[PDB]
Amino acid sequence: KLTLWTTPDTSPNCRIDQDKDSKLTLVLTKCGSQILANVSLIVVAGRYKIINNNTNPALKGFTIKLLFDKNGVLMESSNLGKSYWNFRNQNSIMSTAYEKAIGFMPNLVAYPKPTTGSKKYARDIVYGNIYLGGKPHQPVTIKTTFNQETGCEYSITFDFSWAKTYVNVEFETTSFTFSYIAQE
Amino acid sequence: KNNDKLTLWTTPDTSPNCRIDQDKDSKLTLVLTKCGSQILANVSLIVVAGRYKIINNNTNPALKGFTIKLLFDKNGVLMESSNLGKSYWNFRNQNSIMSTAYEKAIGFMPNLVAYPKPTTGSKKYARDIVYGNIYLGGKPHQPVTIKTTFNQETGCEYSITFDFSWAKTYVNVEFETTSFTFSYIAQE
Amino acid sequence: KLTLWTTPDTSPNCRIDQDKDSKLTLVLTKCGSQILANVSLIVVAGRYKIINNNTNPALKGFTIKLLFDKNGVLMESSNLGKSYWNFRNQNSIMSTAYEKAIGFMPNLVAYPKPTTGSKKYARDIVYGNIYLGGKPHQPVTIKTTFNQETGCEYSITFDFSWAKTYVNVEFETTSFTFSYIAQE
C-alpha cells in the first residue's frame, strides 16, 4: 500500500546502543515520485534516555540507520527492528513481511551511493530541528542522509546532534516532516 | 461533480474566519490534504482587525503570543467553541466548499495512538508537537514561532492547537504571515 | 502525470548568471489540492559557484524564476531551461513538451498576482533554510514566492540569500521540502 511505517504507539522498536532502547516513529507515505516522511524519537533505555552533559560533556549525538536491500526490504544490520517495519494496516502493520518497497526507496540518481573520486553533493541531506520534551529551548538537529551507507542498496540515516549542555533531559522529541525523491 | 473529499480547508480567500481576541479578527488559511496515512497541512495567518492586527511591544512589552484552537468531536466535526469559525471549514469544491457541512472527517483527525489525549498522571511525549517558523510581512527579520499540537485539548475527541509566539520587540508590525507546511499521522 | 520535475541528475539546467551555470533540482508532486515541492541547487560555474564575501562583500544572494503561461507551461524567460522541465518518466522526462499543467500552478486566490491598490499578503511566501556543502554552520535562506512575477500567469520565485561572511564556500545545497495550494 501507500504507507510504510512503524506503528505509532510507544512500544520500543529500535537499538541505538542496546536492543529496544528506543521507539523510532517513522511514517513514509508515497505521493508518486516523492515520499512524505514524518519522524520522531523516544529513547526508553540506555545511555541516550536521559542526557546529562554535566556528567558526559562530550555526549552530543547518535545515529539511527535504515539499510535496505535491492527490494527495499529492511536489513537486519539496521538500528530499526525488522519486525516493526511494514505497510500500514489500520493503526498497526500488515501481519506478514512485505516482499517489495522499491517505490519507497531514496532515488539513486538523486542520491547516489558514495564512490572514491565521485563529486559528493549535499542534496542527499535534509536538516531539521526537533525539540526535547517539546521545549522550544531544547533543540536538537536531525540530519537525514539518503543512500550514504555501505553494505546495502539504499539507506536512510538519521544523525541526531545537539550543541547545548542538556542536564537530566529525557531524549524524546517533537516531530519533523521532510520528503525525498523516490527510486520509482 | 467537483467535491474534493481529500481536502479539508478554509477556502484560500482572505474572508475572516477566526477569532483570536474578537469575532472575525483573523483569516486562518488552513489546508489539510489527505495523502493516505498522513495529512499534509499548510497554514498562514492574517490578523485583519482587533488588538493583534498591529503588534507594538513598546506599548505592550508582555505581548509575545496568542493561540488558535480547532476542537473536534468524535466525527472530526469542528466544535463552535473553537477559535476557527465553522461556516467555511469544509471539504473543498474548487476554490470554495462542499454545499453542506460535513458529518464525518475522521480521515483528517490527528491519530490518537500517535497523539493520545492527556489523562491524569499520563506520560506526555512531545511527538504530538511540530514547531515551525513564519515571518510577519514576509520579512526575514520578523520570525514568529508557530507551535502545532495534536489532541492535547480537554472537552473534545481531537484537537489542532496553533500557539504563536515571538522573541523580538515588534513595533507597529502587522500580524500577517508567510506560510508553513507540516504533516501529521491521520486517525484513519 | 502527477510529477512535474527536473530529472534528478546533476546535468546543469539553469542560469543564475550564465546559461547552464547551475542544476536546480525541483520536483513538484501533485497531492490533490497541494503541490509537494522538493528543491536543491548546485552551482557548477560562474560568479556564484564559489562565494567569497572577502572579495565580494555585497554578494549575498541571487534569484531563480519559473514563469508560467495560462496553461502552466514554463516560459523561455525563466532561469530554468524549458528542455529540462516536464512530466516524469522513470528517472527522465516525457520526450514531448507538456501542453497543460494548471493542476501544478500556485492557486491565484491563495496567491494573487500583484495589483496597485490591492493588499499584498505574505502568505504567498514560504521561507526555508538549506546548508552549503551540508555543513550545519553554512545556512542560506531559500525564500519561495508564488505568482509575484510580471509577464506571466503564474510564477515560482526562489530568492537565495545569506547574512554570514562565506569565504571560498561552494554553492551546492541540502534539500528543502515545502508545499503550496494548487490552482485546480
Residue numbers in the entry:
A (entry chain A), C (entry chain C): 183 to 366
B (entry chain B): 179 to 366
Q: Can I see the authors' text?
A:
Each protein forms key interactions to promote cell infection, with the terminal domain of the fiber, the fiber knob protein, interacting with the viruses’ primary cell entry receptor. The adenovirus fiber knob protein is known to have a highly conserved trimeric structure. Sialic acid (SA) usage has been proposed as a cell infection mechanism for EKC causing HAdV-D. Here we highlight an important role for SA engagement by many HAdV-D. We provide apo state crystal structures of 7 previously undetermined HAdV-D fiber-knob proteins, and structures of HAdV-D25, D29, D30 and D53 fiber-knob proteins in complex with SA. Our findings demonstrate a conserved binding site for sialic acid, common across the species D adenoviruses, therefore suggesting that, along with CAR, the receptor can be used to initiate cell entry.
We performed X-ray crystallography to generate structures of species D human adenovirus fiber knob proteins HAdV-D15, D24, D29, D30, D32 and D53 in their apo states. HAdV-D53 is of particular interest due to the recent confirmation of EKC causing infection, similar to previously identified sialic acid binding viruses HAdV-D37 and D64. The species D adenoviruses are notable for their frequent recombination events and when investigated, HAdV-D53 seemed to have arisen from HAdV-D22 recombining with two sialic acid binding, EKC causing adenoviruses: HAdV-D8 and D3728,29. This recombination event, combining two viruses with similar tropisms explains our findings that HAdV-D53 appears to rely heavily on sialic acid as a cell entry receptor.
